Each structure stands twice: as structure tokens, then as C-alpha cells.
Paper text:
Their genome of ∼14 kb consists of three dsRNA segments small (S), medium (M) and large (L), which are sequentially encapsidated as ssRNA precursors into the icosahedrally symmetric procapsid by the packaging NTPase P4 (15–23). P4 is a protein of ∼35 kDa, which can assemble into a hexameric ring. P4 proteins are the only known RNA-specific helicases belonging to helicase Superfamily 4 (SF4).
The ɸ6 P4 was crystallised with ADP-Mg2+ bound in the nucleotide binding site, whereas P4 from ɸ8 and ɸ13 were crystallized in their apo form. Most of the N-terminal domain residues of P4 from ɸ6 and ɸ8 are visible in our crystal structures (starting from amino acid residues 2 and 12, respectively), whereas ɸ13 P4 lacks the first 32 residues [which are predicted to be disordered (60)]. Interestingly, ɸ8 and ɸ13 P4s also lack such a stabilizing helix; however, the first 12 and 31 residues, respectively, are not visible in the crystal structures and might play such a stabilizing role. However in ɸ6 and ɸ13, more than half of their residues can be superimposed with a root-mean-square deviation of 2.1 Å, including two parallel helices and two small anti-parallel β-sheets, creating a topologically identical sub-domain. In ɸ6 and ɸ13, the C-termini are predicted to be disordered with little secondary structure, and indeed, no density for these domains could be found in our crystal structures. The structures of P4 from ɸ6 and ɸ13 show ordered L1 loops, which line the central channel and contact the L2 loops.
Author numbering:
A (entry chain F): 35 to 306
B (entry chain A): 32 to 92, 94 to 303
C (entry chain B), D (entry chain C): 34 to 303
E (entry chain D): 34 to 306
F (entry chain E): 34 to 304
The structure:
């Protein structure tokens, strides 16, 4: 059954006993509750692995994908229990890493998690990403362009669809790039850190990173945190401290790169 | 034309029967014709069937007369869905980016993609004067003080965001070159955390959402905008605007300073 | 002419929502125009305005008429009391309108209908310059009482709705009316600031008031001190000029600059 | 004279809303004046004021009278408890008034009714200069206890309503009353800041208090330190002078400058 | 004497509103004083205070007295639970009072009743200077546990109401009581900042606490670090001095300056102005 | 040992308010201690802690024990679900306590019970220095996954209550436990900033956690980067030292300074 969209009562014992999917507080063994800013989210990891295996097994993955877009959307959802995060203050996602879940991205053994590609509007993030020959590009919160006509570009509307689609394809062993996390930068607000960027963005990036790590996948996402010019280095350090990997691009070329690999953390750099 | 009147009574988000209703009826269940989106924290719905039906009646009519007679019916084209907390299942909702070589437009270049083209500049930039020199078919007037220009039959006055967007989408669908003077109320009304230049970053997301709803509907809208950036960060704010829409023209002294367009044959840059 | 409802109207009851704006619902009558200043919803009723302006013309004594009809004029401009009344009209402005047949003799012979603002800092002499333009009536709002208030031609008001109703009634009755001042609009319409630290909601409020005057074919004149930071005065004054039918900058009770949208185009002086 | 309602009044029930402001509704009695200081709604009842001031005059012993009548003075100035009581009166100020028949002997023989504020930073000696003007009573509000509070002529008050009721009663009873001080108004009336980091709502509050005093034909004198940033003190003092009937700047317990709205026009010194 | 209501009282029900402040209503008994610190409403009950302070004076074991009577002590200072309880008293301060009949031997022989604050930055030596003044008891609030908590005459407290009730009981029982410290008041009383960077609500809170002490004829001593920016320390310290009966500025566990409102006038030293 | 209620408890119903904190009311049982971090109310139950710590001691395999008892440990530290539960305890801290009978061998032989924080900026090597102190278990919280998470001696946690319950259970079971890190406390405990732009509520939260550990006679060690502005690092570190039982400043995975509240007085690296 589809996740409930009716708001679940937080004062009724019968409502609260139901699963997160069904508007209650009780997580099923397949459900992982997490948060991005004040937004609660659930990923159904077991439904995710099953849908990805079905996609891989299908006669035509492109046809299967179109035919099952609603089932896929149900993999990541906002649980609708009222005040659902009330029992889990300062909710992050359990940090995990395995030498048995590494990925060929920039280095042969990148840990599972999130790799962000950072730079301003003239950085050439999309150009550099296209040159890394990904299998699919998830297009989110960006203006429509000729690139969207490609079969390998998948358009999504909200955060839950973006995550459901990207996690599905990454689980199915596609190299997934998300263009972009613009709406996360714009939407995840609150107290700013010494760089001028909301600290809830760093916590959100670690939450998304650790959901990818738990699911043994790698997601690559473009992001422009729009730091003030005097604090760019601090903001970029805070982003690197939140995720499995980070590439800074300028003129569609790598300025710096840092990755948490199966054999240790590495750092590279080349001034523009 | 038979179009429903969207509900204005607030719909309950805790009652299963209310939530099961369509977006036009105060619930959460989108009909095949309904597209839910957001501009800032404002939820909106465009109804594709009300749009195609009413655009056909507009084509068959005299826009000024038609819009006066059908003012009540156009509320069905773009409306705020009145379900309580309607965006709760769709956090950070944008509009799916789309483009087609079969939906291109003759504006500045022969093959401008569907979307939004913004004309940018400060108070003395001459945005209105440059726009009038591009000889549009209709100018929608929104959020600006009354001027002699408002007496013209080709100027249609609107009051809120939903009326502005419904009139614009209907005219563009009916093949009119429509210009909006202006998006001042979007600059003033879409608030939140500021990025560079002191401009709310939610404005850039708002522009992308409007751009992509136009792209989905295969139309091009043109709009004047003054983002009121601080003087030291104008170039950065204008770059952020260009990164949000199908096209942007920077005007000064009612002349083009620079122009950038997403066309069917790639990105075009001038100036 | 009846009093608008002050009981809050339910936004979840269909019978309450179907009612007119004056009756606590959402349905505008043909005579009602819903608009907003900041987060404050307002309605002007064109029929209450025309009917009561005729009663004011018949009295030929504004000072006495306004004291006696304090209750009735609430029908002309009021806050509609439907809960969340602006929910169907996001980013609500007022339709821009102008006509060569609704022009006014103020500074130029053919000033468009709308709002003319007189701008300057504390000590600029806005009141003194205004008095020298020999208006017929001065509406006194949000200013400390002074000897000027004893004059029969000074009409005191308390809130925004009374100020606007009195102003629109006097202007419709063909009086040259000046409002001293829009201090409370500067102080009360706040939110995200643009340059100078002035709330951009103030510019939207001035355009909304301007366009209601334009729709009603009247001209209102108001003194305003936006209290911009000293480094951004020129920018704030340009933003104010971009919001209304006309603007006069005063210093030492003399014109520094003036810009007007007239029936024959934009006029700039100084 | 009866106690105002303290139960919150429903804003959605017609029977509750029809009640007077003292009874938790929205309908002002002829004796009630609704006004606001910041977001705080207030009512002054003219009949409770005139009745109780006559009782105070008859006692000829303010210190004793105020202790015995503490409960009754709640009727003079109170917060009306109707829910969302200011909803029909956005940006509510108080009608500016002046009369040559209500002038006062304070610094000049014909000071208009209103509020006179005494300004100065720390160590200015606002209290020392004020005590040298030989007031009849000093109301003590929001200040730490001092040997001065032992004096029979010092009357301690706790909140804004008690301070205003005691002040209006004493002034109506023809006492020269000084308020030490408006510190809690500076601290409590918050919002968007103007120059100097001073909330512009403070200027509107001072004009509202000034105009209530002017309507009631009394003069109140109050010490205030708006705590402006050092670079903008002159601008903040200009904004205060523009908000009230009179203002004195003190240093070393001496007058540095003074400006008053008098029955014969504005008077300026230094 | 009994613990106050913790059930929230209705503000729309006439019967609930008619009840005393301790019983969840709005009607102050003659023994109740309503005041506020920031947005926190508080009530001190003079009868619970006088009754329990007399019991503390008579106690053969004061340390056990505080633990044994912890439930009754909630009656002395409490948050009244009427909904929107401050609605009829906007900008509520506490009536300023002073008496030559209620003076105290602290730094000077005739300190007025009120609050004396000891001010200084992190590492100023406020605790060390206070301990050198040989107080009878130290209330420990919002500070990390230290050897002091086991070795000296001290009483550990958890929240603002317990801190104030314990302080008022000890001072009424004629103890020289010091509070280490008011850091949770500095951290918790927020809002619009003064030209100093410090919330002006902190100054109003200090005057409210000062005047409750003055009304009850007691003197409380408290350490405070307002955490002013370095360029505005002098302004913040002046605003604090203008809010209370006395203030001592300490640096390197020594008096830098002191100002006190005494029964015979202001007594001060080391002042830069 | 039963699960605390997650249904929100009424604050206007006398029967609901009379219930224990675990059961959604306001009445603390003799075993319950109510405290707060920021606006977050918390309860530690001393009987759930001693009962489950005894079960953990008996298992002698923390990783396996924590997987099997994940539901039970919710009784040790939980958010009480009574509505407005902190309403009778404004500015709630935790009673400061110390005892010569509850000292710990950490850096010095007699460190008082409480919290010891390890501070340093990005690249300071806090985790590396901590690992070199050979702790028995490292709790991993609010940090990106790393090769270190593969170790059996690393236990991953998700929220503040799980982090504190796991830490208190391990310390009560006589494990030297280190927490990597308090990054989510730095991000999550917001409000008015003091010097360096650090929220002063962070200092109060560190004292509350310190004093809960002191009351329970345990020592917890945690890494923290308070992310002060560069000009006020020294002041922020002094404010942190003033809030807890001990603090170590690390740079290049080496001690630059250390201060500890010991059973025999304050110990400083300045000596």
C-alpha cells in the first residue's frame, strides 16, 4: 500500500502504533527514518533493493522504469505522523562503511556515500560531470534545456522523487549524477555557520551521505552553496567534512578533490 | 465552457474523505489534468484541461473583451489548492525540467526554448521601453503604478500571482507574444534567506518553477524584473537569474547590455 | 450603508466562506476590491464610497460630518474578517489603471490619478511645504497633537482604515486632500529589507494604495519619511518614485526634485 | 466603577464580540478609547478616569489613596481581553488633538497637553534635573529600589497599565507628575530598527501615549534613555522630538536643549 | 503550604481564571506577587516563604532540610500555569521599594535590600573572590560539578524556580547567600540586543529580581558573566549597575570597581567615570 | 524495563499530568531525572540504566548486545512526551555534583565524573588523538561513514537519545567510551550567539550533559569542533572549558593544552 498522506494523530494510541508508512511512529525493520532540515523522510530499504533487482532483471530497463514510476516513488516518502521527529532529537543517520561496498568514481575504491561537485554559476559543474560519462543524470530544480530530451536525463519534481529515483538507479549499479542540489541549498535554512551557510545544510549532506553508505551506493550531486566570497574556503571545508567525497570545479576542470576511499582519505588540488 | 470553480473553503488534512478529493476540491489527489507546483512557499495548481478549453475559446473570440467576460472561469486555470498543508508530501517541490525541439519560439532568436525569458535592470534601465520596442501582442500589467500605457487595449491589468499566470498562460497558449510588466511583486513577495547581493535565494527557485511550468505547457513568457541587488553583487545576482530560466536580457538606457538564451540548438550568448 | 462584520469568519465552513467580504466571507461583491498592505488585508467598497461621498458633499462641512459619521465610514475601507482571507490571492497587488479623463491639478495640470508622496527626512519641512500648496483639508494621522490640529481644515484619524476612508471620501467629494502623514505605514509595514534598510513591502504597499486611488479616479497626497540609511537615500527615493504616480523631494520646505506621471508623459524637475 | 474582564473573549462568537471592550468584546462604549503601544492593545475609560480622579482630589493624600484603590484603578487603563482585538484597526494610532483650553505650566506657561520626555544617556542626571523642577509626585517604574522610594511623594508601579492609570489619575487631579522612567518601554517595545538601532515602534508608542494625554487634556513628564548607538544619538533625539509635545536634553543635571509644542507655536532653546 | 498546580489553566473559562495563581488561575492572593524574567512568568508566595524560612531557621540540619522539603519548596517560587498569564500586565516589572529598616552587611554595613551582582569574564576569578568574602552558603546553578560541590557549604539546584526559592529561603533565614551563578539567566533571557550586544531583557530581568528581593527585605549576591563584546564592556557594565542594588567588577579575583545603593546613598570605588 | 510512551500526553488533563515522565505525564518517578539540551527535554532513568548496564556487563560483547537490545535502551534516555513538559522548570540545568568516590583514570588518575571534551578545528586530528588513547569503544554519531566504522569497537548511533543511552550504558559497564562526535549538538543547539558566533545554549547543553554524567558517576569523552569565527577561538575554547569537567585542545593529533577538574583540584597544562 502507498504511504499515507492523511496527517496521523500524535495523541491517539491506535494512530501512533501504525508504521511510518501508515501515518504512525513505529518503524518497520525495512524503514529508515531520517531528516533533511525540519523535513522528516523515510527510505524503505527492502522495497528499494527489490525494485532495483527487478529493474536489472527486466527485458528492457527503460520500459520497466516508465511502467513502475509510482511504485518507485513510494520508496522515499515524508511520514505523515504529526510531530514525527519528537522521539528522535538531533536525528542523524548511523555512519557505516565497508570495504565490500566501494565504487569506481575518480578513484577505484570510493566509499559508499555522497560525492558532491561544488562551484559557482560559471564553474562548469555540468560540463565536467558530462565528461565523467555518467549513465544517468537526474534533473531537479534546474531550467529545462536540450539536455532534458536525452533518454539518459530523468526529470524529477520534489526531494522525495529525486531521492527515490537516484537511489533506485544507483542500487541497480548505474553511475548516477544529480543536477542538482540547488533546491536543498535554497530550502534547508536556519542558523548560519562561520561561513554564512546554514549549518542544517551540512547536517543534511551527512544524513544523505550516510543513507547512501547504508544502502551501499554512491550518489554524485552538483551543488553551489552560494557562500560569501570571503568565507568560501571555510564553507568548502565544512562540505568536505560532511560527505564521502567532494570535487571543486572551475572552468569545467578540477581545482581540488578529496575522497574517503577504502584505503584512506586523499586530497588533491590544482589552482585555477 | 464548462470549467469547475476551485474550492476556496480550506480542506482538512486529518480527515480521510477530505484528503481523497481532487486538488480543485480541497484535497490532495491530483486529477490527470492537475499539476501541483510551488513558487516560494505558495502552492499552485495549473489545470491543463481548463487551460486548453479556455485557450480555444480565447482563440475563437478579442482578448480584452474575452478576459472581462471570463474572469471567473480563469480561476480554474491557475489556483492555490486549499487543502491544509498541501505541500506536506512534496518537500522542496520544483517542476520537472522538460524541453522539446517541437516547442520552440521566435523571441530574440528563432528557436528560443519554452520557458521564461526575463528582462533585467534597475529603476532607470528602461525595461518597459525596450520591451515595447520588441512589439509584443499583449502586455500584462502587474504590481506597477498606473500609467498612460494602461489605457491601451493591448494592456491587460491583473491583481495577484494566480490571475497573472492564468492570463499569461492563456494568451501564450492562444499564440500571443505576451510580456509581463512586471515581476516586481515576485521580487518583493518571495522572501527568505538572502544569498549574494541581499537577494532571497528562494527567488531563483521561484523563477525556475515558473520557467518549468511554461516549458511543460510548451509556451514562452517574457517578464521584466528588477531583483534589487546591492551594487557590489549585481553581476553575481544576474548570473544566478540566468542560471534559473530559459533566457535573460540585461537592459540599460532601453538597450541590450547582454543576452543569454537556451535555444533548440544550444546556449546563445551576446554582449 | 451597513457596517462590515467584525466577528472572525470561519475559513472551513462553506456557508461562512460563500458570504461577501463585508460579511466575513471570501466572495467579493461587484462593489468590493480586495487588496493588501503588508500582511493586512483591506477592502474598499465603491458603492459605500460614492453614496457617502454624496452625503459629505451635501453637508458642505467635512469636520462636523466626519465626527458624526465615524461609524458609517467603516463601510468604505475595512479589514475583511474572513480567516486567512488572502489565501486564494498570493502576491496580491492592485490592477494598474490610468485614464486621460481622470487627471488632477496638482503641481502640473494633468497629474494622473494615484498617490503623490512628499519625501524628506526629519526636519525637511514636508508639512510646511504642503501647507504652502494651500490644500483644502489635511488629514492628521500618527503625528503628535499641535496648534495646527485646532484648525477646522485639519481632520484627525486613528487607524489605517479610517485614514484611507476619510481621504478617499474627501478626494471623491473634490477636495485637495493632504495626509500628514504616512509615518505609521513606514513604521508598521516591515519585513525583508531592500537597499537603505527599507522594507520592500513598503514599496508594494505604496503601489497598492496608488492603484486603488487610480481605480477610483482620485489623487491623494501624503508626507512620508522612509528613514533610509544615509548612504542609500538616492536609491530609496528612486524605489519610491517607481512605486507611485508622483513624488516630490523636499528640503528646508523647498522642492529639491519632483517627478510626476502625467496624462502627457513622465515629468521630471530639479 | 467595576473591574475589567480578564477571561479571554471569543473573536468567533457574535454574542462575545458585541460586548464592550471592558467585558471582553470589540464594541467600544462611548467612554472607551482603544489604542496600542507596540503590539499591546490598551483601553482608557474616560468615565472611570473622571470618577476616580474626583475621589483622588477629595482625599488630598495620593500615597494612601493609591494603596487603598489599587483594584479600582484597573478600570482606568487596561488590556482589553477580546481575542485579536486590534484586527479591525490596523496601524492604530491616537487622533491628534490640541486645545488652547488645555495648556500647562511646564517649562513654558502654555505647554500643550501631551507627553514631555526628558532624554539623556548614562550619568546625564535626568532624575536630578527633574527633582529640581519640583514635581508633586514621581511615579517609579522599572527601576531598582533606591532611598528615593521611601519618600511619600514616590509612588511605585509594576506594569504599563498601572503606570499609565496612576499617571493619568494624578495629572487629571492637577498634580505635576514625573515618571521615572520609560526604561521598560525602551526595552519592551521591539521590532524593526531605524537609525541608531532604536525600534521605530518606540516612536509610534511615544506618539500614541502623547496623543492619549492630549485627548484627556493632561501633561505627563517622563525620563527616557532610548540607548541609541553613539553615531546616531542626534538622529534618534530628532525622531523623539518629532513624536511628542515636548523634549528636554539634559547633561550634568542642566538643560542642553529643549523643544516644546506650545499654545502659541513651537518653541526651541539651544 | 502545598506544591502549585502543574496542569495548564484555561484562559477562556471564567471558573478557571477566578482561581489563585498557584491553582492555575489569574487572581493573585494577597500573598502572591506575579513578575517575569523575559517571557517566563513567576510568582513568589510570601506566606510559603515566611512559613518555610521559619522552619529552616528552626532546623537542626539545614542540608537535610532542603532535600526533605523539596516538594513544599515548589510553593515558594513557581511558574503560574494559567494560559497567557501575563496578558493583563504588559511590560511587567516589580514595584521599586527601599527601607532603612531592611539593610545588610555586605561590602558596606548598610547595603539596601535587592540583588548584588559580581561581574567579570571567563577566568575573572568571580568564584575565588566570592569565596574570600566568606559567605555562609553558595547556591550552585548551571555550573559543572567541582570539588567545591563536596567540600564547601553549598546547595545544588536545577532550574530557575528552585534557585530563586532556595536563595530567598536562605536569605530570609539570615544566611549570607551567594549564587554561583546566573549563567543560565544570561544564556536563557534573549531578545532584542542593546547597543552592547546583550539582550535588554536581561537588564529588565535583573531589575525584576532585584525588586522582588527588595520587597522581601533580603539581599542576594550572584555571579554573572554577560558575555559582552570586548568593545562595549563598559556600556554593558553600566547598564547592569543601573539595574540592581549593587555591582562588583572582578578581575584576577580582585575588585576592579564597586557601586552600591546604601541606606545613606551611593557608595562606590574604582569607578572610571 | 518497558518502552517510554511516544503518544503525546495532554497538559490540560489532570489524569494525564499525574502519570510518570515515561508514561507521558509530569510526575517524575524516584528513578527519573528530567533535564534539557537546548529546547529538547530529556529524561534519564537510573533503574533502567543499572538494570540494562548489568545485562551488558554479563554479555561481554557490546556490539551484539546493543543490536539485540536496541528497543529496551529507549527506556534509559528518552524525550518525555508530555506536552510542554518543561513548563514548570524554566532554564533547567542539572544539579552540579562531585565525589572523591567517583573519579576516573583519563589523562590523570583522578579525573572527576562528567564530560571531557576534545576540541580542535578541521584537520586538528581529534579522532586520531582519541584513537591513540586506546579507548574500549567509540560511539559514532553525526559524522560521514569512514573506514573506521568497519571496526567491531565502533558503535554507530542515529539520534541524541540513542547516543547518550549507549554512552551511559557503556560507561556504567566500565568501558572507556569516546564519542565521535558532538558535531550534531553544535549544529542543532541554536539560539542567541555569544562571541565567535557560537550559540550560548551550546555551553549550557555541555554543562547539562556534564552534570548528568557526574550524577551517574561516569566519565564520557567527546570530540567537538564548535566552529567559532577565527578571531574568537581562544574565547570559545575558554567558555567550553568553563562548562565541563575537562578539555583537551588538539592540533596535528597532539595535545597543545589540557585542563581538568580532578579530585585534588584543577589541573592545567600551563602547570
Amino acid at each position: 500500500a502507498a504511504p499515507a498522506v492523511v496527517e496521523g494523530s500524535s495523541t491517539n494510541a491506535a494512530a501512533v502504533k501504525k508504521s511510518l508508512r501508515d501515518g504512525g511512529m513505529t518503524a518497520l525493520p525495512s524503514e529508515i527514518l531520517f531528516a533533511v532540515g525540519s523535513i522528516p523522510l523515510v527510505v524503505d530499504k527492502d522495497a528499494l533493493s527489490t525494485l532495483a533487482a527487478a529493474l536489472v532483471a527486466s527485458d528492457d530497463p527503460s520500459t520497466w522504469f516508465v511502467a513502475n514510476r509510482e511504485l518507485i516513488r513510494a520508496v522515499v516518502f515524508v511520514p505523515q505522523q504529526n510531530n514525527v521527529l519528537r522521539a528522535t532529537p538531533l536525528l542523524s543517520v548511523r555512519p557505516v562503511a565497508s570495504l565490500s561496498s566501494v565504487h569506481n568514481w575518480q578513484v577505484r575504491n570510493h566509499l559508499s556515500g555522497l560525492h558532491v561537485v561544488v562551484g559557482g554559476t560559471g564553474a562548469g559543474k555540468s560540463k565536467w560531470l558530462n565528461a565523467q560519462t555518467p549513465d544517468v543524470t537526474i534533473r531537479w530544480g534546474e531550467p529545462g534545456e536540450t539536455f532534458d530530451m536525452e533518454e539518459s536525463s530523468i526529470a524529477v519534481a520534489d526531494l522525495t522523487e529525486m531521492l527515490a529515483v537516484a537511489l533506485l538507479l544507483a542500487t541497480a549499479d548505474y553511475r548516477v549524477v544529480i543536477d542538482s542540489f540547488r533546491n536543498l541549498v535554497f530550502g534547508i535554512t536556519g542558523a548560519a555557520g562561520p561561513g554564512g551557510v546554514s549549518v542544517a545544510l551540512y547536517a543534511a549532506l551527512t544524513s544523505l551521505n550516510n543513507i547512501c553508505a547504508e544502502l551501499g551506493v554512491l550518489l554524485v550531486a552538483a551543488i553551489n552553496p552560494m557562500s560569501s566570497d570571503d568565507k568560501v574556503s571555510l564553507v568548502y571545508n565544512n562540505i568536505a567534512a560532511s560527505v564521502a567525497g567532494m570535487t571543486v570545479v572551475n572552468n569545467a576542470a578540477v581545482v581540488s578533490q578529496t575522497i574517503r576511499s577504502g584505503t584512506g582519505r586523499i586530497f588533491s588540488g590544482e589552482p585555477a
